[PDB]
Amino acid sequence: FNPYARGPNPTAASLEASAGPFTVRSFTVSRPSGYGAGTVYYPTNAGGTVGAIAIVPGYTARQSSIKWWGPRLASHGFVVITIDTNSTLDQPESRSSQQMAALRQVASLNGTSSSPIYGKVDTARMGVMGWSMGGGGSLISAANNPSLKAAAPQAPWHSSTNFSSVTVPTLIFACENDSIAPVASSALPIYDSMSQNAKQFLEICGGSHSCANSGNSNQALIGKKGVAWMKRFMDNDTRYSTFACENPNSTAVCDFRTANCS
Ligand SMILES: *[C@@H]1O[C@H](CO)[C@@H](O)[C@H](O)[C@H]1NC(C)=O
Ligand SMILES: *[C@@H]1O[C@H](CO)[C@@H](O)[C@H](O)[C@H]1NC(C)=O
Ligand SMILES: *[C@@H]1O[C@H](CO)[C@@H](O)[C@H](O)[C@H]1NC(C)=O
Ligand SMILES: *[C@@H]1O[C@H](CO)[C@@H](O)[C@H](O)[C@H]1NC(C)=O
């Protein structure tokens, strides 16, 4: 028996749906501690403590760019914080620090009797996501904090592609037609650098740099993969092993790679 398993046995249809099995509520963080602002999404009815995921936007961008992940993930049994950075022009290292400050504050709110997430969080089970420089920051977070259970950045950018130190299970979303952080010089080299981990590469056909953002036309596939990855690795939930590891057989997938996935 897996003490972290939540929710019904998954299906393709249940993971491609706009909403998971749990009812979601949200709040604005009242006093953001070490980052600009944040929104916490949480399930009201998960039936046990859940892991936490912190999601960071790209350069110039705000929560709106990554907000669709909050309800999508929380509805499957996660506490999700979407942040604004101290500056829209923060670089990846700063974004990583702020992402981890957001996870810290979620852990603090677990212990805060006034918070809607009082006693809802397993602080030992955490995940990192983000777009562009926030995706680079997620990879920095993973490199610096190997106790993180999963990473799933989208269209990442970092001034270095070498993440050979990362031992955290890492899914990279990439966008075929990205001209900001081209796949061939950013996402794919970042993927190829990682030698120690479970990892996956999923490139979306015809995608611009914003192909995994709020308002994308591939929420069925991208949401299925992001939830499956986080369930598999944050919850050690092998019910999700096939959904996490499979080549999905979608018209939307223009490049796929996976390694050390079980
Ligand atoms: C973000 O700003 C807060 C001040 O509100 C500060 O505590 C934190 O250090 C800043 N983080 C970075 C990485 O600059
Ligand atoms: C969060 O608090 C609840 C109860 O108030 C507790 O059961 C749980 O273990 C806490 N999370 C962590 C990681 O300690
Ligand atoms: C990344 O950095 C490590 C540590 O220096 C080095 O051994 C390795 O060759 C580099 N990886 C790539 C893919 O360049
Ligand atoms: C992949 O999906 C298409 C679209 O529905 C389907 O026609 C095809 O038979 C599928 N591939 C496999 C493995 O069956």
Query: Which residues neighbour 161 within 8 Å (Cβ) at sequence distance 6 or greater?
Result: 185, 186, 189, 190, 193
The domain locations on the chain are: 19-259
Least distant ligand from the CA of 4: 2
Active site residue 178: yes
Reading the block at residue 30, the tokens are: 């009242």
Under DSSP, the state recorded for 144 is: H
Q: Are 89 and 59 in contact (CB under 8 A)?
A: yes
Q: Assign domain 19-259 to its CATH architecture.
A: 3-Layer(aba) Sandwich (3.40)
Within a 10 A sphere around the Cβ of 158, how many other Cβ atoms?
Answer: 24
Distance CA 259, CA 243 (A): 14
Collapsing DSSP to helix, strand or coil, 199 comes out as strand
If you measure from the C-alpha of residue 33 to the centroid of ligand 1, how many angstroms do you get, rounded to a whole number?
8
Query: Which residues neighbour 87 within 8 Å (Cβ) at sequence distance 6 or greater?
Result: 36, 94
The closest residue, in CA terms, to atom 14 on ligand 1 is 94
Ligand 1 contacts CB of residue 98 (under 6 A): yes
CB burial string 28-48: b at 16+ within 10 A, e below = ebeebeebbebbbbbbeebee
Under DSSP, the state recorded for 33 is: S
Ligand 1 contacts CB of residue 91 (under 6 A): no
Ligand 3 contacts CB of residue 112 (under 6 A): no
Ligand 2 contacts CB of residue 121 (under 6 A): yes
Least distant ligand from the CA of 38: 1
If you measure from the C-alpha of residue 119 to the centroid of ligand 2, how many angstroms do you get, rounded to a whole number?
5
Q: Are 207 and 187 in contact (CB under 8 A)?
A: no
Query: Which ligand 3 atom is nearest residue 162's CA?
Result: 1
Q: How many CA atoms lie within 13 A of 120 on its CB side?
A: 24
150-151 vs 121-130, strand pairing mode: parallel
Ligand 3 contacts CB of residue 162 (under 6 A): yes
Catalytic choice (122, 178, 235, 237)? 178
Which technique was used to obtain these atomic coordinates? X-ray
Nearest to 186 by CA among 170, 216, 162: 162
Distance CA 62, CA 65 (A): 6
Distance CA 93, CA 226 (A): 23
If you measure from the C-alpha of residue 85 to the centroid of ligand 1, how many angstroms do you get, rounded to a whole number?
9
Distance CA 226, CA 69 (A): 9
If you measure from the C-alpha of residue 239 to the centroid of ligand 2, how many angstroms do you get, rounded to a whole number?
25
Resolution of the determined structure in angstroms stands at 1.7
What DSSP element (H or E) covers 96? helix 92-110
- Cα–Cα distances in Å, from 11 out to 7, 14, 33, 141, 249? 12, 5, 38, 31, 15
